[PDB]
Each structure stands twice: as structure tokens, then as C-alpha cells.
Amino acid sequence: MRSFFSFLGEAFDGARDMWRAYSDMREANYIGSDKYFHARGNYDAAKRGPGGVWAAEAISDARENIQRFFGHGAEDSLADQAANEWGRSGKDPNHFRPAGLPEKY
Amino acid sequence: MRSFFSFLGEAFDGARDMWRAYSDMREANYIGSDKYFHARGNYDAAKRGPGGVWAAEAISDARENIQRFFGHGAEDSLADQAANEWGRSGKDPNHFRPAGLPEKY
Amino acid sequence: MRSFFSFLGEAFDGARDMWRAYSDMREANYIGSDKYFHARGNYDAAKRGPGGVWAAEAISDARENIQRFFGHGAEDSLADQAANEWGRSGKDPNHFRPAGLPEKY
Amino acid sequence: MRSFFSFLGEAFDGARDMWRAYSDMREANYIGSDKYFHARGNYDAAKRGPGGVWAAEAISDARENIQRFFGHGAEDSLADQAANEWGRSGKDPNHFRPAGLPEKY
């Protein structure tokens, strides 16, 4: 049962990382930080393992869905995917860090 | 969703912890280590949080069921439960440790 | 492990039901129907069992959090919570149904 | 999030189906029915979808592990693997049904 429960643990820790990215983005209320939190969320989940990568993909897709329900432009979403996959691929999320974002984020 | 995914992450980390106690038990093949591994498994799972406590219970109940199917004694079962609850409530599982059980257990 | 996997199966059927209510809401694009869809989603999930009730609460909380991020009004939020609880408790969601909402919803 | 929660639901309904195979085996206390329940359990789980196939594999492997712990003939374990895979692949589990097994199983 090791890998069975391991993969589920990864997925739910990953889900937790994604929600924490969102939660931080909300708290930070910081202009131009969207892409950084997109990347950091996916990066964090991915680090958990295949379960996490899986969760990140599903949740990124869901967030894109909700975002345009509220009027997100199609080109904007694409730029967001780029950030998602950049972090999910394990590349440094700080690439998208806006000047002056507090270090706890 | 933080507490939703956290609980689930806890349940599955705990489930992994319980299975790891079984696999360690099987590998150690150490006569009279039964109660230690029961306590340890429950202790480790409970340490995860409310989800781990929940999984420790479910899996302890399941293990009892299995053992009985294979001819485990009613009395030996009651002793197992006492070890389960000992660990699950945060008491040191080493209380039941046989001296000279390899330290990797 | 029956009740363990059952509660988990109920949580995830319920999570699916909540999401289906959102998907339908977005597809229906029907003014004044959101109260119906909140009640329906919560109703369907609660129907699953204790696991669904639990997932419904978590996701209603999640949805409120997200809508508020995008500018949702205070009174509307409290009305939304009222529709959530109404459905979750077994009361008929069709109470809020806009006459003229397509039958497939 | 549909497919995400969908896969999870399948795995937990699959897990539940596997446990019920075991519970039915325990209740039936019926000589020569071991293969039938292995087959039926895997067949039931597989029917839930991909997530169920996944749970069935995991749980069969775990069941074999445990059975061997209490002593199980190697030709029997191989025969059990065949039954598992027969059912998981969707073939009629009644292929393995012993004469006289109550039709509620």
C-alpha cells in the first residue's frame, strides 16, 4: 500500500501548496504578483512528487476556468499557463517576482 | 480548502505510517516485537494530526479483523488494542520495545 | 476499511457534485440562478452521506473566499451562505429555481 | 476539477469493492471460493474506472503480501494472481465460482 498512499499524500500536499499560493496572493494584495504565485504554487506542488505534479495541473486548469468566468482575457490566461508550467517544470519561480514582494512570500 | 486537503493529507500520511509499521514488522521478523510495532504505527500516524488519528483507528480495526480471520486469539487481540491506543494517544512506543530490536525500527 | 473508504468516496462524490453545480451554473449563464446552483450543489453532495456534507461545507467556504476576492457583495455572500445551508440540510433546491431555467439544470 | 475528483472517487469506490470481496469471503466461510472473490473484487473495482483498476492492483499486491506473512503456498499465490488479473481485465469472475456458493455472493 506504500505507493498507493504515497501518491495520494503527494496529491493532497500538492493541493495544499496550490491553495497556499492563492492564499498568499490574496494576503499580499501585491500588484503584478499573479505570475509569481502561479509559478510558486506549481513549483511547491511539483516538489511533493508525481502526486503533486498531478494536483498542480488539475488545479491550475480549474483556476484558469474560474478566472475567465470572472472576465480574464484569453491572452492573459496563456501568460498564466506559461508561469504555471514554468514552476511545475521546477524552474525558479523567483523569475516572476515583482520588485519588493515581502520575503515571506 | 486548506483544512480539507490538510486532513486528507494527514489521513494518508498516517496510512503510510501504519503500513510502514507492518512492513518493518515483517522485515524485522523479531519474535515479541508485535506490540512495539502496533504502538509505533499508531504513534507515528497520530503525530500527523487529526487525519492520522482517524486513519490509525480505521487501519488498526482492519488489521484486527484480518488477524482474526487467520486465527488470532481473542485475548491476543485485546492486548493488541491496548498497544494501539497507547501509541495513538501519544505514549512512547519504546515502552514495548524489545532490547536488541535493531535501532532502525 | 469499509467506512474509511466510504467516507472518502462520499467526500469525493460530493466534491464532484459541487463542481458540477459550478460547471452547470457557468454553462447556463442564467441571471439570478446562482442561489439555485449553490443549493443544488450542496444538496447533491449532502445526499452522498457524511463525507459529502463535509466536502460541501469546505467547498462552499472555498467558493465564498474566491468570489469575495473578485468583488462579491456582503449581503449577497450572506444570501449565498443561506442557499448553501438550505441545500445541505435536505431542503429542496428548486425553491430557488428561476422558472425558465432549462430542465437539464 | 471533475476528472481529479472523479479519479479519486473511483479509487475509493474501488477500494471499497475490494474490501467487500474480503468481507463476503469471511462471511461465506466457503471452501474453494478464494479465487472467485479475488476475481469478483478486482472485477468490481475495475468497473468503477481507471482509478478503480489502480486501487485493485495495489490492494491485491497488499493482500498477497499479508497472505504470505501467514504462510501461503507459492502455486496458490500465482493462482490467486491469475484470478485477480482475470477479474481486473473484465472477464467473468463466475469462471472461478465453486458449486453451491450462495447467489448473494
Swiss-Prot record, chains A, B, C, D:
GO cellular-component term (any): extracellular region
Q: Which top-level group of life is the source organism from?
A: Eukaryota
Q: Which UniProt keywords apply?
A: Acute phase, Amyloid, Amyloidosis, HDL, Heparin-binding, Methylation, Secreted, Signal
Any one Pfam family match given in the protein's UniProt record, by short name? SAA
Q: Which GO terms describe its biological process?
A: acute-phase response; lymphocyte chemotaxis; macrophage chemotaxis; negative regulation of inflammatory response; neutrophil chemotaxis; platelet activation; positive regulation of cell adhesion; positive regulation of cytokine production
Q: What is its main location?
A: secreted
Gene Ontology terms, MF aspect: G protein-coupled receptor binding; heparin binding
Q: Which SMART domains match?
A: SAA
Summarize what the UniProt record says about post-translational modification: This protein is the precursor of amyloid protein A, which is formed by the removal of approximately 24 residues from the C-terminal end.
Propiece residues: 78-105
User: Where does the record place the modification N4,N4-dimethylasparagine?
Assistant: N84
UniProt region (Disordered), positions on chain: 81-105
What residue spans carry the region label Important for amyloid formation?
Answer: 2-28
The task this protein performs is described as:
Major acute phase protein.
* Disease implicated: Reactive, secondary amyloidosis is characterized by the extracellular accumulation in various tissues of the SAA1 protein. These deposits are highly insoluble and resistant to proteolysis; they disrupt tissue structure and compromise function. Elevated serum SAA1 protein levels may be associated with lung cancer.
Q: How does it assemble?
A: Homohexamer; dimer of trimers. Can form amyloid fibrils after partial proteolysis; the native, undenatured protein does not form amyloid fibrils (in vitro). Apolipoprotein of the HDL complex. Binds to heparin.
What this protein is called in its record is Serum amyloid A-1 protein
Organism, scientific name:
Homo sapiens
